[PDB]
Tab-separated table of C-alpha atoms and ligand atoms in Angstrom:
chain	number	residue	atom	x	y	z
N	11	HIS	CA	20.057	12.394	15.485
N	12	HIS	CA	16.552	11.449	14.688
N	13	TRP	CA	13.208	13.047	15.549
N	14	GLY	CA	11.573	13.174	18.990
N	15	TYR	CA	10.255	15.110	21.638
N	16	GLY	CA	13.262	17.419	22.931
N	17	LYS	CA	14.506	21.187	22.301
N	18	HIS	CA	16.738	19.798	19.621
N	19	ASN	CA	14.685	17.463	18.078
N	20	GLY	CA	11.013	18.121	18.627
N	21	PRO	CA	8.101	19.375	16.667
N	22	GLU	CA	9.814	22.655	15.616
N	23	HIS	CA	12.877	20.881	14.352
N	24	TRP	CA	10.560	18.302	12.392
N	25	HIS	CA	10.029	20.447	9.131
N	26	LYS	CA	13.700	19.914	8.132
N	27	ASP	CA	13.573	16.287	7.697
N	28	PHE	CA	9.754	16.347	6.713
N	29	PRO	CA	8.863	19.896	4.673
N	30	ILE	CA	5.065	18.592	4.828
N	31	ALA	CA	5.275	19.875	8.648
N	32	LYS	CA	4.453	23.231	7.203
N	33	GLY	CA	1.825	21.663	4.778
N	34	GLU	CA	-1.950	22.424	4.366
N	35	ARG	CA	-3.477	20.086	6.437
N	36	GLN	CA	-1.181	19.164	9.295
N	37	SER	CA	-2.762	17.699	12.880
N	38	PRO	CA	-3.527	18.278	15.189
N	39	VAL	CA	-5.236	21.301	15.566
N	40	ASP	CA	-7.241	23.348	18.056
N	41	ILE	CA	-11.108	22.516	17.732
N	42	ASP	CA	-12.792	25.938	17.808
N	43	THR	CA	-16.400	24.670	19.102
N	44	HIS	CA	-18.132	27.773	17.809
N	45	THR	CA	-16.688	27.922	14.756
N	46	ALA	CA	-17.319	24.109	13.986
N	47	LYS	CA	-20.106	23.680	11.595
N	48	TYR	CA	-22.985	21.140	12.937
N	49	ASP	CA	-23.276	19.098	9.415
N	50	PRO	CA	-26.615	17.310	9.587
N	51	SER	CA	-25.391	14.894	6.510
N	52	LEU	CA	-22.995	13.705	8.957
N	53	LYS	CA	-23.526	9.793	9.741
N	54	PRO	CA	-23.188	8.006	12.937
N	55	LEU	CA	-20.060	6.610	13.690
N	56	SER	CA	-20.168	2.655	13.251
N	57	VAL	CA	-17.176	1.244	15.450
N	58	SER	CA	-17.132	-2.755	15.571
N	59	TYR	CA	-14.779	-3.744	17.494
N	60	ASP	CA	-16.356	-7.131	18.978
N	61	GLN	CA	-13.789	-9.201	16.870
N	62	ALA	CA	-10.540	-7.343	17.286
N	63	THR	CA	-7.675	-9.590	18.024
N	64	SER	CA	-4.824	-7.723	19.656
N	65	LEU	CA	-0.999	-9.131	19.282
N	66	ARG	CA	1.515	-7.104	21.205
N	67	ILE	CA	2.629	-4.228	22.717
N	68	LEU	CA	5.990	-2.163	21.641
N	69	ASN	CA	7.524	0.675	23.100
N	70	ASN	CA	9.078	2.250	19.846
N	71	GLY	CA	11.068	5.352	21.909
N	72	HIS	CA	7.884	7.546	20.938
N	73	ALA	CA	4.770	6.040	22.476
N	74	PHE	CA	3.404	2.269	23.479
N	75	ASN	CA	1.949	0.780	20.564
N	76	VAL	CA	-0.751	-2.138	20.449
N	77	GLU	CA	-0.723	-3.773	17.465
N	78	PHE	CA	-3.842	-5.942	16.543
N	79	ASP	CA	-4.228	-8.826	13.762
N	80	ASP	CA	-5.725	-6.517	10.699
N	81	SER	CA	-5.525	-9.647	8.299
N	82	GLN	CA	-9.341	-10.246	8.276
N	83	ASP	CA	-12.675	-8.072	8.058
N	84	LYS	CA	-12.720	-7.677	11.844
N	85	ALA	CA	-12.454	-4.555	13.739
N	86	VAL	CA	-13.639	-2.024	11.528
N	87	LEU	CA	-14.551	1.905	11.488
N	88	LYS	CA	-17.467	2.933	9.040
N	89	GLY	CA	-19.909	5.767	8.662
N	90	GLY	CA	-19.517	9.103	10.406
N	91	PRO	CA	-18.105	11.130	7.941
N	92	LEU	CA	-16.104	8.284	5.684
N	93	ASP	CA	-16.668	6.478	2.420
N	94	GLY	CA	-16.079	2.544	2.655
N	95	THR	CA	-14.439	0.706	5.769
N	96	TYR	CA	-11.189	1.234	7.436
N	97	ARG	CA	-9.501	-1.408	9.534
N	98	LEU	CA	-8.150	-0.897	12.887
N	99	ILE	CA	-4.547	-1.817	13.026
N	100	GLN	CA	-3.202	-0.228	16.332
N	101	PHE	CA	-3.683	2.071	19.111
N	102	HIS	CA	-1.493	4.562	21.205
N	103	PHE	CA	-1.663	7.623	23.418
N	104	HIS	CA	0.108	10.704	23.574
N	105	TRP	CA	0.313	12.094	27.173
N	106	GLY	CA	2.198	14.906	29.485
N	107	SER	CA	4.237	15.482	32.156
N	108	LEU	CA	1.345	17.017	34.269
N	109	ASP	CA	-2.375	16.467	34.020
N	110	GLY	CA	-2.718	19.964	32.623
N	111	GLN	CA	-0.989	18.904	29.149
N	112	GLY	CA	-0.621	15.829	27.002
N	113	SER	CA	-3.700	15.837	24.352
N	114	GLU	CA	-2.436	16.764	20.892
N	115	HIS	CA	-6.070	18.098	19.666
N	116	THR	CA	-7.419	20.940	21.904
N	117	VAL	CA	-10.890	22.159	22.244
N	118	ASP	CA	-11.261	25.660	22.700
N	119	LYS	CA	-7.446	25.806	23.714
N	120	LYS	CA	-8.125	23.090	26.677
N	121	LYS	CA	-5.817	20.621	26.794
N	122	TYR	CA	-6.383	17.314	28.236
N	123	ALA	CA	-4.084	14.992	30.184
N	124	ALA	CA	-3.740	12.475	27.306
N	125	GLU	CA	-5.009	11.272	23.885
N	126	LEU	CA	-6.003	7.922	22.552
N	127	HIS	CA	-5.388	7.445	18.735
N	128	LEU	CA	-7.205	4.111	17.596
N	129	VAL	CA	-5.553	4.022	13.490
N	130	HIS	CA	-7.639	2.119	10.977
N	131	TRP	CA	-6.554	2.133	6.993
N	132	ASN	CA	-9.208	2.234	4.607
N	133	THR	CA	-9.506	-1.397	3.275
N	134	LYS	CA	-9.894	-0.102	-0.494
N	135	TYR	CA	-6.021	0.109	-0.572
N	136	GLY	CA	-5.060	-3.098	0.460
N	137	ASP	CA	-3.073	-2.214	3.581
N	138	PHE	CA	-1.465	-0.101	5.686
N	139	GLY	CA	1.671	0.978	3.972
N	140	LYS	CA	-0.401	1.692	0.537
N	141	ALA	CA	-3.391	3.531	2.581
N	142	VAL	CA	-0.842	6.126	3.989
N	143	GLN	CA	0.131	7.079	0.681
N	144	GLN	CA	-3.515	8.402	-0.253
N	145	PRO	CA	-5.287	11.434	1.149
N	146	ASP	CA	-8.006	9.042	2.426
N	147	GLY	CA	-5.971	6.265	3.634
N	148	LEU	CA	-6.566	6.515	7.328
N	149	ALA	CA	-8.877	7.119	9.791
N	150	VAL	CA	-7.932	8.246	13.293
N	151	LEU	CA	-10.384	8.086	15.941
N	152	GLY	CA	-9.164	10.483	18.826
N	153	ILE	CA	-10.563	10.317	22.368
N	154	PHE	CA	-9.541	12.562	24.976
N	155	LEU	CA	-8.405	11.482	28.599
N	156	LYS	CA	-9.124	13.354	31.847
N	157	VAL	CA	-8.118	12.502	35.009
N	158	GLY	CA	-10.693	11.344	37.770
N	159	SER	CA	-12.051	8.014	37.846
N	160	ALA	CA	-10.332	4.840	36.857
N	161	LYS	CA	-10.992	3.461	33.303
N	162	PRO	CA	-11.271	-0.385	34.040
N	163	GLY	CA	-10.647	-1.256	30.373
N	164	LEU	CA	-7.149	0.752	30.411
N	165	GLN	CA	-5.966	-1.408	33.349
N	166	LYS	CA	-4.858	-4.368	31.287
N	167	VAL	CA	-2.508	-2.083	29.685
N	168	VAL	CA	-1.289	-0.166	32.393
N	169	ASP	CA	-0.087	-3.424	34.201
N	170	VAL	CA	1.941	-4.219	31.326
N	171	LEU	CA	3.962	-1.418	31.094
N	172	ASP	CA	6.502	-2.378	33.514
N	173	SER	CA	7.564	-4.853	30.905
N	174	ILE	CA	7.963	-2.546	27.832
N	175	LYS	CA	9.834	0.387	29.829
N	176	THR	CA	12.599	1.346	27.387
N	177	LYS	CA	12.695	1.919	23.589
N	178	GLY	CA	12.770	-1.531	21.590
N	179	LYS	CA	11.195	-3.594	24.351
N	180	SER	CA	7.960	-5.570	23.399
N	181	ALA	CA	5.474	-8.116	24.487
N	182	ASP	CA	2.738	-10.416	23.675
N	183	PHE	CA	-0.450	-8.983	24.106
N	184	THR	CA	-3.322	-11.089	23.451
N	185	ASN	CA	-7.498	-10.613	23.710
N	186	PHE	CA	-7.269	-6.803	24.683
N	187	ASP	CA	-10.613	-5.516	23.916
N	188	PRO	CA	-10.922	-1.751	22.614
N	189	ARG	CA	-14.232	-1.812	23.157
N	190	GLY	CA	-13.343	-0.719	27.066
N	191	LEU	CA	-11.370	2.651	26.056
N	192	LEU	CA	-14.780	4.261	24.625
N	193	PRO	CA	-16.552	6.851	26.210
N	194	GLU	CA	-20.712	6.840	26.144
N	195	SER	CA	-21.377	8.777	23.344
N	196	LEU	CA	-20.030	9.015	19.695
N	197	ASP	CA	-20.811	12.403	19.127
N	198	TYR	CA	-18.063	13.733	17.435
N	199	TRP	CA	-16.012	16.623	15.177
N	200	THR	CA	-14.272	15.679	11.874
N	201	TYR	CA	-11.826	17.372	9.653
N	202	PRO	CA	-8.953	16.372	7.285
N	203	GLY	CA	-5.460	16.226	8.575
N	204	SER	CA	-2.110	14.338	9.027
N	205	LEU	CA	-0.185	11.732	11.068
N	206	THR	CA	1.382	13.715	14.400
N	207	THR	CA	4.452	12.560	13.736
N	208	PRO	CA	6.965	12.154	11.327
N	209	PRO	CA	6.470	11.257	8.327
N	210	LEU	CA	3.388	13.631	8.569
N	211	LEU	CA	1.484	12.113	5.888
N	212	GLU	CA	-1.756	13.941	4.794
N	213	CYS	CA	-3.495	10.861	4.882
N	214	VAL	CA	-5.937	11.067	7.934
N	215	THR	CA	-9.708	11.529	8.328
N	216	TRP	CA	-9.605	12.693	12.075
N	217	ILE	CA	-12.755	11.838	13.832
N	218	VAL	CA	-12.529	13.578	17.694
N	219	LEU	CA	-14.915	12.482	20.196
N	220	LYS	CA	-16.413	15.016	22.133
N	221	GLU	CA	-16.924	13.154	25.621
N	222	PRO	CA	-13.295	12.370	27.186
N	223	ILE	CA	-12.941	9.200	29.011
N	224	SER	CA	-11.876	9.351	32.678
N	225	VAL	CA	-8.647	7.948	33.911
N	226	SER	CA	-7.015	7.536	37.370
N	227	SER	CA	-4.218	9.681	38.254
N	228	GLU	CA	-2.669	6.632	39.077
N	229	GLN	CA	-2.902	5.066	35.525
N	230	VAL	CA	-1.187	7.919	33.858
N	231	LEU	CA	1.304	8.114	36.372
N	232	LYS	CA	2.162	4.660	35.045
N	233	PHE	CA	2.092	5.994	31.286
N	234	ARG	CA	4.681	8.530	32.891
N	235	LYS	CA	7.014	5.686	34.208
N	236	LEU	CA	7.936	4.545	30.367
N	237	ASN	CA	11.185	5.633	28.978
N	238	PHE	CA	12.276	7.633	25.547
N	239	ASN	CA	15.562	6.119	25.875
N	240	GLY	CA	16.650	2.265	24.831
N	241	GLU	CA	17.994	-0.308	28.117
N	242	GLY	CA	21.099	1.310	29.279
N	243	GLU	CA	21.059	4.376	28.242
N	244	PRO	CA	20.603	7.637	30.659
N	245	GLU	CA	16.834	7.734	31.565
N	246	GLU	CA	14.538	10.104	30.200
N	247	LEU	CA	11.178	9.592	31.129
N	248	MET	CA	8.502	9.360	28.237
N	249	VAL	CA	6.204	12.129	28.957
N	250	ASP	CA	5.133	15.275	26.750
N	251	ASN	CA	5.391	12.912	23.382
N	252	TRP	CA	2.693	15.336	21.904
N	253	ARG	CA	2.681	17.573	18.856
N	254	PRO	CA	1.232	20.988	19.672
N	255	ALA	CA	-2.063	22.351	17.469
N	256	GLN	CA	-0.955	23.516	14.179
N	257	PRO	CA	-2.349	26.100	11.685
N	258	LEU	CA	-5.788	25.342	10.438
N	259	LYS	CA	-5.555	27.048	7.058
N	260	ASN	CA	-8.270	26.135	4.887
N	261	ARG	CA	-10.164	23.590	6.774
N	262	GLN	CA	-13.584	23.458	8.255
N	263	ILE	CA	-13.943	21.224	10.995
N	264	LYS	CA	-17.705	19.547	11.080
N	265	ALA	CA	-19.607	18.679	14.243
N	266	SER	CA	-21.679	15.584	14.221
N	267	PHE	CA	-24.061	17.126	17.031
N	268	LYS	CA	-25.997	20.352	18.019
P	8	RAK	C1	-1.984	10.400	15.037
P	8	RAK	N1	-1.062	9.563	15.792
P	8	RAK	S1	0.731	9.335	15.137
P	8	RAK	O1	1.577	9.296	16.263
P	8	RAK	O2	0.930	10.154	14.031
P	8	RAK	C2	0.555	7.798	14.679
P	8	RAK	C3	1.298	6.721	15.143
P	8	RAK	F1	2.070	6.649	16.442
P	8	RAK	C4	1.142	5.487	14.962
P	8	RAK	F2	1.564	4.166	15.417
P	8	RAK	C5	0.303	4.871	13.732
P	8	RAK	S2	-0.208	3.124	12.758
P	8	RAK	C6	1.872	2.576	13.162
P	8	RAK	C7	1.803	0.745	12.481
P	8	RAK	N2	0.731	0.852	11.389
P	8	RAK	C8	-0.064	6.183	12.810
P	8	RAK	F3	-1.061	5.919	11.877
P	8	RAK	C9	-0.278	7.393	13.364
P	8	RAK	F4	-0.593	8.236	13.129
P	9	NA	NA1	-22.131	-0.249	14.154
P	10	ZN	ZN1	-1.170	9.646	17.597
């Protein structure tokens, strides 16, 4: 009876195994755009993904994860609110059963169809496993997805999903360029938070881009053909794999713009 995204094991139950679920800096949150403080001291975000090297793709029963070779100083996030340099390790998405829900963060209560998380670890802690034990260990770049015109840079992902339909399946997935997942503008909101899945560690500086990417109805319909279950178990479609907004508590969300 492990954690998941149903009635008996979903977000409202996670606190029993992971009591930090009711902590002071949990994610995601609603971003109240009026309340967010413009911070002129914030820097432009530096995203340097030209040398990113992807390794594979896995359905872990919770999402699909595209994992990168992070053993050299390649694909790095820096600037913005960050001190030092954070190296890309993986990305994944959260999405809904319908286009009107799926994102983790919300913007003035608006839910997007999905949300992409690019996960990076602070190089000062040597690898991801040590970084998650630190308050400034991770930087996650979050990008909203709305449904409209296709995202041509997503299609290579979408077309491999058929090979990783069920929990535990993986594939080789090389030469995927995550620059094709970025919107035009790097304007962002930032605040201190957590992983959005167990173990819910409070290790993340969140950087959430204001401009969403557009993906097509057909692209998100293929996300919703994945399964939570393993091969040969009753089919439960992988949909609604998002945590709802959590209390903001002490925190201030800062804006890089306006
Ligand atoms: C914020 N979204 S999340 O679901 O909590 C999440 C993941 F799914 C991840 F896969 C990772 S990286 C896991 C391999 N290094 C992560 F840091 C992470 F934060
Ligand atoms: Na840069
Ligand atoms: Zn995530």
